[model samples]
Target: WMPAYACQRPTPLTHHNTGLSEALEILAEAAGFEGSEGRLLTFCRAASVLKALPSPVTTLSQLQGLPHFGEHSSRVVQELLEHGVCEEVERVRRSERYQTMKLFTQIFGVGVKTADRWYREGLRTLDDLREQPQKLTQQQKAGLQHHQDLSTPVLRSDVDALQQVVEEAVGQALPGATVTLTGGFRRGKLQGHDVDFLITHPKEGQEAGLLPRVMCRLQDQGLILYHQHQHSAFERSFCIFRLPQPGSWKAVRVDLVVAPVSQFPFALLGWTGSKLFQRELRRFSRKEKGLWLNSHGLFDPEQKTFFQAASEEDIFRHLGLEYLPPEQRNA
Candidate 1:
């Protein structure tokens, strides 16, 4: 789940644009460029912008304050103004390899290598690939089965219904346990494909046995179509559940994590993840602070002790970050 801000809003202008000079500099930073590709995209965007502007642009300095136009990018803008479009962009767009790569990668569970392999096998479409049954993984099969529903954005109503079922199960299994829905829905999103729940009991040791018990009960009730329980020696126990999709009775992804009350907040924050945000947080913990962080607990290298957090806010506070509300945690 991306925090609302990260997912809902467009990337900031500064990140998307570089002046002509700056655009070229950033292009140099793009992986695999090796300074040979030049600022192809930078010019394309600049050209598109200039074509839309009211007047003819003369100098880069004159366009200094323009949005999405960087110093290096302006040169391409000028070329597009002089011509119709940038030559390199046009060439790359028409390349057979680029087009094939784009189409192949769109298949469920297909990565660059898999896509390339499929392309070489003369599999040009899903139907062509499906004719060969042995290539798909179990996850890919599930992904393809629900491709249409999963492709669409999840509605808030769907998430709420999923939450209700999960919370109901939690209440039935553990009287004093709390089930908090985190992730995009917690941040106020109306829908999500998957729902995440963080569970904690009122008593410290009580949370330990709750996950297995709840999972067993849910399975017995036939609510779970497929599930796996994960036990972590260093952290808490967790489980992944497949819930019935509305209307069609299809199974969708749902995850459950149980932590002691002492680790609830940290667990909540850890589980309310935008994959990138969680990655960055972990990176910061290790590289900058020499701390080990995961869904379970935070370990300090110097102290060689796990620091228990009472809440997600406390975890952020401990890291010297602002206490981000669930909705604002997209970063």
Candidate 2:
């Protein structure tokens, strides 16, 4: 049987069912816009199933045995395969609410709730929202200021330069601390909207306070355009970097996260995400294994203990999952 959780299979960086998955994901994004996390998860799960398929889905029968292919999801795929478009998806794409929400939510600091509030206030365009400067947060103001540059796709070559700079700062901040490129780029995406780096020192306690030092070094060199810190299991910084171009500079979004050596593997798995994969993996862990999984570590609730993983494969092994490489985590 095809597994229900996307974590169970290898979903390649480039899949055979792009058109079909794209359609379902649009529905997923639309559901997210409406604040229906349930529907969003459902559609996302359905889309991920298509991504893992070894071959393109050619007929309705191809989806008969698939998990997460509810009637609505099946119908969308059926219409696309037969008629070249799904009216529901097309209509959603054409709607003003969807368009506006998509635009607002794409901003660096704006989320669905903020976008929805702006929509209710009758704000339609960037300029419309710009008129009310007081309503925007400092982060949102920086986001708006660099909106055009941030929209430019970050290329693979750009990632190399950024990684070098980040590594230099990391080296100076804590000797032997390593910076790993994660997120979509690690999953083999040739282009992404931003770059994510996972930092950790080989010695556990040394990673503590590493972020501020790194950020300070970067700032001293005039690399930081804007920055904000958020914490979860790790010290995290969301920043805009002023990347040097041939004769000019471009603003690029970057995420820097510092984890302890003990939790590096789990952090790597969680950070190198096709967000749906991480969500589904955690869901699978909790529901099937009676375990709690997060970027920090995996916990066994009944035993009141945590699993120690030396590598990403160790974490998968702990969860009884086949190891899939970063490239296969495109789900």
Candidate 3:
């Protein structure tokens, strides 16, 4: 039997229930657009359950014991099994609100609230927002400027080139600093919306104050188009890199994160995400295990103690879950 939480199962990057899961995820996204966080989580959990299934579900009866399959999710699956498409999914696909929200949210600086605000303001197209430059944040302006290029997928080849440049910059900034490719690309995706890299040094304190130097190096080389550094518990740089194309260059979103050696494993697991997989893992960690988990570490509130993990395996063992590799974390 499949486990109740996604962290308990191995969900491969490629799954047998793509059609069903995609349909459900559309509903999940629609729920988020409507500001229904609870419903969004329900649909996302149900879709993840499908992604973990060993085979295609040919009948509604097959979903009976699935953990997250509720009346709504089950009915949608049943409709798809009987007919080629689910009517509700089709209706959402045809929605103006859904399309507009999807477009707005796809931008780097835009979130649900911002997208909803734009929709409520009757601003439908990128052109509409462009006409009023004063309304846009600096980040939003960059996002809009590169909207067309950002819409294009970051190919695996592009990842290879980008990693090389990032590594060169890091090597110059701090020798022996290592860079790990994370996110969907690390999960075996052939293409992704953006590239993510985790930077670290073997010695804990060496990674501190490393981001500014790396950013300076990239900027000097004219590789950075736009960059914003977030001084999170772990330092992160959300940047647009000017990657070379055949003729000129294309703007690509790249996230650079620095974590101390002590938190590398936790950071690796958190950054190498399929979104819902990480969410479910954190939820499972707290709700089932009485532990608080984040990109930095796991904590036991009752004991007032922090769990130390030397590797990703250690984190899984601490959570009482099977060790799922990056490829299997695509829930």
What's the lDDT for residue 135 in model 1?
A: 83
Please list the Cα RMSD from the true structure of every candidate, rounded to 1 decimal place: 8.3, 1.3, 1.2
lDDT of candidate 2?
0.92
Worst 10 residues of 2 by lDDT: 227-236
lDDT of 2 at 49: 91
Residue pairs whose backbone atoms clash in candidate 2 = none
Instruction: Give the alpha carbon lDDT tens digit for every residue of 1-331 in model 2.
Output: 7887889888888878999999998999999999999999898889889988888899888887888889999999999989999999999999999999999998989999999999999999999979999989999999999999998999998899999999999998878999999999999999999999999989879888889899999999999999887766588999999999999999999999988999999999999998988988999999999999999889998999989889999989988999999998888
Model 1, which residues run further than 4 Å from truth?
1-124, 208-225, 232-251, 260-262
lDDT of each: 0.60, 0.92, 0.92
Estimate the TM-score for candidate 2. Answer: 0.97
Superior candidate under TM-score, 1 versus 2: 2
Count of clashing residue pairs in every prediction: 17, 0, 0
Residues 211-263, candidate 3, lDDT per residue (tens digit)? 99999999998899899998967899999999988998999999999999999
Tell me the tens digit of each residue's lDDT in model 1 across 35-69: 23335444433433433344445544457555556
After best superposition, candidate 1 residue 84: deviation in angstroms? 14
